[PDB]
Amino acid sequence: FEAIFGTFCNRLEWVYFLTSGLAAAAHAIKFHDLNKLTTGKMLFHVQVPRVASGAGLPTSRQTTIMVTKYSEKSPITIPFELSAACLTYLRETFEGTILDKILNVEAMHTVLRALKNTADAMERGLIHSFLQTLLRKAPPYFVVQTL
Amino acid sequence: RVASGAGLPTSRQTTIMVTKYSEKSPITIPFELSAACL
Amino acid sequence: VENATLARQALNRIQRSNILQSFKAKMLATLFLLNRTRDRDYVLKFLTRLAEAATDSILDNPTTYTTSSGAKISGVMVSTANVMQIIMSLLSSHITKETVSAPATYGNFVLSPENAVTAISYHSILADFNSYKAHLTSGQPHLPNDS
Amino acid sequence: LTCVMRGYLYNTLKTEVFALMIPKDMYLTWEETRGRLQYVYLIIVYDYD
Amino acid sequence: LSQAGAHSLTPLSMDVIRLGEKTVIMENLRRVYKNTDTKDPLERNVDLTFFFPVGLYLPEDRGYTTVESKVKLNDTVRNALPTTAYLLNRDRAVQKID
Amino acid sequence: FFFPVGLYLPEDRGYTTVESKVKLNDTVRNALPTTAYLLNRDRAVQKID
Amino acid sequence: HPGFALTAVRTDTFEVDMLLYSGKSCTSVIINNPIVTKEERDISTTYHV
Amino acid sequence: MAAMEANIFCTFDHKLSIADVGKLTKLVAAVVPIPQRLHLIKHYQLGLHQFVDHTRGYVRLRGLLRNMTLTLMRRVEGNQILLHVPTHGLLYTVLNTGPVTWEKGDALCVLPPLFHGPLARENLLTLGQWELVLPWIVPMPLALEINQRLLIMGLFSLDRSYEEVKAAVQQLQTITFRDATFTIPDPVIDQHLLIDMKTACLSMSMVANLASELTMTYVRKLALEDSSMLLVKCQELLMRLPARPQHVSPDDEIARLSALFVMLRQLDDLIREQVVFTVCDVSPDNKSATCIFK
Amino acid sequence: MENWSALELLPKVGIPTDFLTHVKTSAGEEMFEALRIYYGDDPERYNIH
Amino acid sequence: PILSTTTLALMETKLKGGAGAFATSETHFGNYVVGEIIPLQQSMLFNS
Amino acid sequence: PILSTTTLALMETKLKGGAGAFATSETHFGNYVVGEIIPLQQSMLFNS
Amino acid sequence: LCTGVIQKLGWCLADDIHTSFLVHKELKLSVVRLDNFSVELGDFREFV
């Protein structure tokens, strides 16, 4: 004999953004017209809490404060591909035999598996790009502990 | 895969097939009986 | 286990050099570690690193080796008598004498008739042939279980 | 024989692609590393000996 | 922004820790980079810059010693003039730089 | 296991860390390395020459 | 020995597991639907998202 | 590995104002080069500001631009630029960049921009001290006489005083092709220019050797009897010094003419860069055209 | 030399995988034998003889 | 600063010495030890 | 590396000394002790 | 004339280029092999 016991495919873990706890630091909004904007600015207006003081001593003043922040840009990309034989066996059945049905269901399953792997890669890349954009503005511990 | 950012060449789809084989190791014990019982 | 994250392709010269460095460190550190030191915490840390270091099997029967009150068995450590009783005496706060389930008999596994026909014809065995044939004709590309 | 003028080299039904073979002595590269795309040419150089 | 979206909620399990009435979610990201290609960005290569001298000359008008009970060198002008330094490798092993 | 016998130290880099613990006679039969001493299976000295 | 005290400088890189902490909703990320982009060739048709 | 991406998305990581995107909306159907091809590229490699040297070698920029990959601009939006790498022999619209009037039928070349810098005063996407330097698209005879005057400047650079070169550049920089003046920036010496001069002198020596007596004497044989203005204008650049030919042969001289055509081709390829656009119909405001052969 | 068409075509039982190291390291350093590491999608599984 | 001694003798007391001996810095007449300001030759290759 | 020495007196001050002496390695003017890197003599005699 | 000649044959993927061998009547002949390749012909240009 040769005793082919078992053929084993892989089941990938379907990790999403909101399933991970890293989305606790995130505020995930979906906005369909995102590519039509340049940048998102945010404005803040603070006047300071002053304090009275004793005479023979200079005092404070009302100082307006306006601060402004901006958004960021980080596109991502996954290039999955399909052979032309897969597209040929997906649409075009012929001769009605058993093996033609096997090739058709194999074409359907490789397209489905490529789509699922592409979606999983998109989720992992979203987590990765969020982590990159998070780490690119975090100061080290000694800076904030000094401050 | 992981979705890479701009200006970075990313990996394409990749499938890996491996094979594991069995190991045979037989065992044997000899033992003898006389003809006085027979 | 301390370099699984970092290497993701064929190894570099620096990577294999760090592997050799960790070999020459831990081989000198961990020979006769029971004969060297006999504290509870380091031995427990070494044993839990040894337990984490192995990978789990591809096949696992979940209902066998069930510890009473519903616990499950990860692994088994075998040794000689003196080393085992030294482990017993050194860590008494972690040993529990418990009755677990066990598979009562062997795994009776037999070939199908079509397995025998393929075995005499093409000198090979594909186990659970009927499940392969039925899932192939149906189109479901994932089996429930293997042989 | 069936040759091609333009396009890829493939079996019928496009089940598998066909490769181009060249012997080692006719093979010639002029750079230590290659780009993403590279053209393949033909060179007949004349030794006027 | 908070008015925009985040309508429904679902429960899911994770692990937290309590530090001065502040509960914070502990997380690791091995499952997102298990059999992937890109490097995990929490694994990082930091780099320090070391420096050491070799071949100096301490002044002899104020020369002294503090290990005269611990060490003893013979009367040698080569001993009393530093030209080599001794350092360690990434392994604990004596290296020489002349 | 491996060990040197008869290995010669330099004199220009001569030093001694252990002088309160031990002191030897000035004869070079003790000040030139020509023999060595190891330990047996039991903790006992032995001489290799 | 010449009249020279060369002072050596060098660097050493270390493979280091860091850790990161951020507060809840420290930044808001807006996204959109994925954009399927086709690309056709004779031997295969790749895609882009 | 992955194949060749027909569509290339570029992303401006730096923050754009509305005026820059408004200027970029006028840049549709324009040609831009890229050094490498990826599906999602950064904005530094796009353009030509990555290759502006302090040498400012126009032959160096020309040879570098010849090895880039040409693309067309499309679908300008927020921090994203579609680039279509065009395929062979298909129809494509195009928008002109340099101040050259275009006609129909004349093939076009791609060229580095003349008078590059702040002197041309181009407000093309200036951000992070990086400009968007657009390669010019010129017709055939403009690029031909540009390469010709560069090679003539190179051949005149040898064994001449510096003020002789300064008296030559005021003659050779003025090109008035199609009623629009143009100037040659910084004609200097370069090792690539040395390579062009070496192959030019070798090809000139070879065609001087392979020239038969009838080719050498046809100008005198025509100037003894015929008379025209063009004959006079081509005779005055020649030097001073019915007979039967000594020896002629058809089969030898056709081989001589084939090898001579080969040597003139090996001289011609220096000034003729490449055809990259073949115009069918321009827009009547001379701001756009259609083309083939990409 | 194993029938990889028989692996890709036949229905396969799914598992939660656990390689100790990264799987491409295990392929590039031969923990196993006959490692089919084709990239993209090779359509050679389609034609059946 | 990194552990670097000029003589092999003053190196040897750093190996007979106990933990934290690398942080010190002793000098002989024409010899000296500069010690490491952080025990990374004492601990980071010694986690075992 | 195994425990080796040059003189009987230096082996005497090694063996007479306390536990952990065999990990150290001292040197006299012309005599020397190399010490075994693991305490195998210590462990193998101490479990006895 | 035409000391060398040159023409375009095609373009490859620049990653499938590898060494294989041809066999004809049990005779090995080692080859460079280009898997995903498309032909693109052109006339004989020349250079001297």
Helix/strand/coil (H/E/C) assignment for every residue in H113-129: CCCCCCCCCCCCCCECC
SS3 for E66?
coil
Residue type, E10: T
Beta-carbon contacts of residue C123 (< 8 Å; ≥ 6 apart):
A1, A2
- Both tokens of I10, joined, read 């036949």
| Rounded distance between C-alpha atoms, residue B4 and residue H152, angstroms | 50
Query: Strand locations in chain E, DSSP E?
Result: 15-19, 22-26, 43-53, 72-73, 85-88, 94-97
CA G17 to chain E, closest CA, distance in angstroms equals 5
Q: Give a three-class secondary structure readout of chain A.
A: CCCECCCEEECCCCCCCCCCHHHHCECCEECCCHHHCCCCCEEEEEECCCCCCCCCCCCCCCCEEEEEECCCCCCCECCCEEEHHHHHHHHCCCCCCHHHHHHHHHHHHHHHHHHHHHHHHHHHHHHHHHHHHHHCCCCCHHHHHHC
Which residues of chain A come before a gap where C and the next N are over 2.5 Å apart? none
Q: CA–CA separation, C101 vs A69, rounded Å? A: 63
Angle between helices A98-135 and A84-91 (to 10 degrees): 130
Q: Residue H67, SS3?
A: coil
Query: Strand H7-11 to strand H40-42: parallel, antiparallel, or no bridges (unpaired)?
Result: parallel
Distance of CA A56 to the CA centre of its chain: 60
Candidates A13, A131, A135; nearest CB to E31: A13
What CA–CA distance (Å, rounded) separates A39 from A24?
Answer: 24
Region of C41 on the Ramachandran plot (φ > 0 left; ψ -120 to 50 alpha; else beta): alpha
DSSP string of K1-48? ---BBS-HHHHHHHHHS-TTTTT---B-SS-B-B--SS-HHHHHHH--
- Cα–Cα distance between I12 and I34 in angstroms, integer? 18
Exposed, middle or buried by CB within 10 Å (0-12, 13-18, 19+), for F28?
Answer: exposed
Beta-ladder partners of E14:
none
Q: Assess L1–D contact: CB distance below 8 Å, yes or no.
A: no
Q: Best mutation site among L6, L17, L48 for testing chain H: the one with the most H CBs within 10 Å?
A: L48
Cβ contact, residue pair A128, E38, below 8 Å: yes
H helix or E strand, kind and range, residue G46: strand G44-48
Q: What angle do CA F16, F20, F26 make, to 5 degrees?
A: 60
Contact A4 C58 (CB under 8 A): no
Residue H182: strand, helix, or coil: strand
User: Letter for the amino acid at H231?
Assistant: L
CA distance G44 to L18: 21
Chains E and F touch (3+ CB pairs under 8 A): yes
In this complex, do F33 and K26 lie within 8 Å of one another by their Cβ atoms? no
Closest listed residue to residue H62, CA positions, set H47, H51, H71:
H51
Backbone angles phi, psi at A94, to 5 degrees: -155, 150
Short-list K20, K16, K22, CA closest to K4? K22
Note whether H38 and B7 are within 8 A (CB): yes
Would you say A76 and A129 are in contact if contact means Cβ atoms under 8 Å apart? yes
- Chain G neighbors (3+ CB pairs < 8 Å): A, D, E, H
CB-based contact, I39 to chain D, within 8 Å: no
Phi, psi (degrees; rounded to nearest 5) at E78: -65, -35
Q: Could you tell me the end-to-end alpha-carbon distance of chain B, in angstroms, rounded to an integer?
A: 74
Residue partners of B30: CB distance under 8 A and separation at least 6: none
Report phi then psi at H91, rounded to 5.
Answer: -85, 135
CB H274 within 8 A of CB H66: yes
Report the C-alpha gap between C86 and C103 in whole angstroms.
30
* Residues of A with Cβ-Cβ distance to H18 under 8 angstroms: 38
Query: CB neighbours (10 Å) of residue H66?
Result: 12
Q: Is K24 on the interface with F (CB under 8 A)?
A: no
Query: What is chain E's alpha carbon radius of gyration, rounded to the nearest angstrom?
Result: 29
Q: Where are the alpha helices (DSSP H) in H85-212?
A: 140-157, 162-172, 191-210
Contacts of B2 in chain E (CB under 8 A): 33, 36-38
Touching status, chains D and K (3+ beta-carbon pairs under 8 Å): no
Cα–Cα distance, H129 to H49 (Å, whole number): 9
Amino acid (one-letter) located at J43: S
Angstrom distances, CA of residue I44 to CA of A91, A97, D19, G42: 18, 20, 13, 16
Q: What's the reported resolution, in angstroms, to a tenth?
A: 4.0
- With touching defined as 3+ CB pairs under 8 A, do chains A and L touch? no
Percent helix, percent strand, percent coil in chain F, to nearest 5: 10, 20, 70
Q: Cα–Cα distance between K43 and L7 in angstroms, integer?
A: 78
Residue F37 φ/ψ, nearest 5 degrees: -135, 130
For A123, what's the count of Cα atoms within 13 Å in the CB-facing half-sphere? 19
Nearest-angstrom CA–CA distance, H219 and E65: 102
Residue G5 CB neighbours (<10 A): 12
Q: Is J9 in contact with F17 (CB distance < 8 Å)?
A: yes
- Tokens 């701001």 locate to H287
Characterize the bridge pairing of strands H107-111 and H80-84: unpaired
Q: How far is A112 from chain B (nearest CA, A)?
A: 14
Burial zone of G15 (CB within 10 Å; 0-12 exposed, 13-18 middle, 19+ buried): middle
- Residue H247: CB partners within 8 Å, gap ≥ 6? none
K20 and K43 in contact (C-beta within 8 Å)? no
Contact L9, L39 (CB under 8 A): yes
Structure tokens at G46: 């790749």
Are E41 and A27 a contacting pair at CB < 8 A?
Answer: no
**What token pair was written down for E30?**
């091995």
Selected for mutation to probe chain D from I47, I48, I49 (highest D CB count within 10 Å) is I47
Closest CA to E92 of C16, F9, K37: K37
CB contact under 8 A, A79 and B22: no
Angle at B10 between CA B7 and CA B16, to 5 degrees: 175
Which candidate, L37, L48, L43, places its Cα nearest to that of L10? L37
The Cα–Cα gap between I31 and H115 comes to 62
Q: What single-letter DSSP state applies at residue L3?
A: S
Residues C146 and C59 sit within 8 Å (Cβ to Cβ)? yes
Any bridge partners for residue D7, and if so which? L39
CB contact (8 A) between residue A26 and residue G31: no
Interface of E with F in 3-22 (CB under 8 A): none
H263:L14 CB<8 A: no
Q: Measure CA of the first residue to CA of the last residue in chain J; give whole Å.
A: 24
Q: What is the dihedral of CA A108, A111, A115, A121, to 10 degrees?
A: 130
Residue I32's nearest CA partner among D23, H212, A109, B19 is: B19
How far is the alpha carbon of K45 from chain F, nearest alpha carbon, in Å?
A: 7
CB F20 within 8 A of CB F29: no
Cα(D46)–Cα(D25) distance, integer angstroms: 16
Q: Which two tokens stand for residue K25?
A: 């390695």
- Assess whether chains H and K touch, using the rule of 3 or more C-beta pairs within 8 angstroms: no
Alpha-carbon span A141 to C69, nearest angstrom: 45
How are strands ordered across the β-sheet holding L18-23? D20-23, L28-34, L18-23
- Give the nearest partner residue to J29 out of E65, E84, E90, using CB atoms: E65
Report helix, strand or coil for E93.
coil
H108: helix, coil or strand?
strand
Task: Check CB contact under 8 Å for I34 and B19.
Answer: yes
The CA distance from F35 to K6, in Å, is 6
Tokens of H241: 């010094």
Name the nearest CA neighbour of H138 among H83, H180, H173: H180
**DSSP SS3 for E64:** coil
Distance CA H116, CA H122 (A): 9
> In whole angstroms, what is the distance from residue A12 CA to residue C58 CA?
15
Structure tokens at L31: 């080859």
Pair C131, C112: CB distance under 8 Å: no
- Alpha-carbon distance C95 to C100, whole Å? 14
Q: Locate tokens 């373009």: which residue?
A: L11
Under 8 Å CB-to-CB from D7, ≥6 apart: which residues? Answer: G42, L38, L39
L18 touches D at CB < 8 Å: no
The size of chain C, in residues, is 147
Decide if H35 contacts H68 (C-beta within 8 A): yes
Nearby residues of D30 by Cβ (< 8 Å), 6 or more positions away: none
Cα end-to-end span (Å), chain K = 22
CA dist., res. H17 & res. K15, Å (int): 82
J8 CA to chain E: closest CA distance, Å?
A: 7
Sign of CA dihedral A83, A86, A88, A94: positive
CB A139 within 8 A of CB A34: no
Asked if H13 lies within 8 A of B9 by C-beta distance, the reply is: no
CA proximity to G21, closest of A16, C5, E19: E19
Q: CA A106, L14, G48, I22: dihedral to nearest 10 degrees? A: 70
Question: In terms of C-beta density within 10 A (0-12 exposed, 13-18 middle, 19 or more buried), how is residue K4 classed?
Answer: buried
Tokens of H181: 């003046």
Look at residues C146, C57, C138 and name the one whose alpha carbon lies nearest to residue A3: C146
Q: For residues E40 and H99, what is the distance between their CA atoms, to the nearest angstrom?
A: 51
Give residue ranges of F with CB < 8 Å to any K CB: 1-5, 7, 9, 14-18, 21-22, 24, 28, 30-33, 35-39, 42-43, 45
Based on C-alpha coordinates, what's the Rg of chain C?
23
Is the Cβ–Cβ distance between E50 and G9 less than 8 Å?
A: yes
Closest CA to E7 of G28, A29, A32, A15: A29
Nearest chain F residue (CA) to J12: F17
**Do E11 and G38 contact (CB within 8 A), yes or no?**
no
Name the residue in chain K with its Cα closest to that of F39. K3
The residue of chain A nearest to residue E25, with distances taken between CA atoms, is: A21
Per-residue DSSP letters for H13-65? Answer: -SPP-HHHHHHHGGGTT-EEEESS--SEEETTTSSSGGG--SS--HHHHHHHH
Q: Is A56 left (phi over 0), alpha (psi -120 to 50) or beta?
A: left
H75, two tokens: 């679908």
Experimental method: cryo-EM
Q: What is the CB neighbour count within 10 angstroms for residue C44? A: 14
Q: Measuring CA to CA, which residue among A119, E38, A73, G34 is closest to residue B10?
A: E38
Q: Tell me the C-alpha to C-alpha distance, in Å, between residue D2 and each of C90, D9, D11, D12, D18.
A: 80, 11, 11, 12, 13
Distance CA G7, CA E50 (A): 11
Cβ pair G46, A80 in contact under 8 A: yes
DSSP string, D1-49: ----SEEE-B-GGG-SB--EEEETTT----SSS--SSEEEEEEEE----
The encoded tokens of residue I20 equal 């100790």
3-state secondary structure at position H283: coil
For residue E54 the two structure tokens come to 């070799």
Q: Which of C5, C21, C24 is facing E43, going by the closest CB pair?
A: C5
- Please indicate whether, in this complex, the C-beta atoms of L4 and D44 are within 8 angstroms of each other: yes
Taking alpha carbons only, the member of A136, A132, G18 closest to residue B8 is A132
Cα–Cα dist K2/K36, whole Å: 4
CB-based contact H259:H210 (threshold 8 Å):
yes
G16, two tokens: 């280091």
Measured distance CA(H7)–CA(G46) in Å, rounded: 12
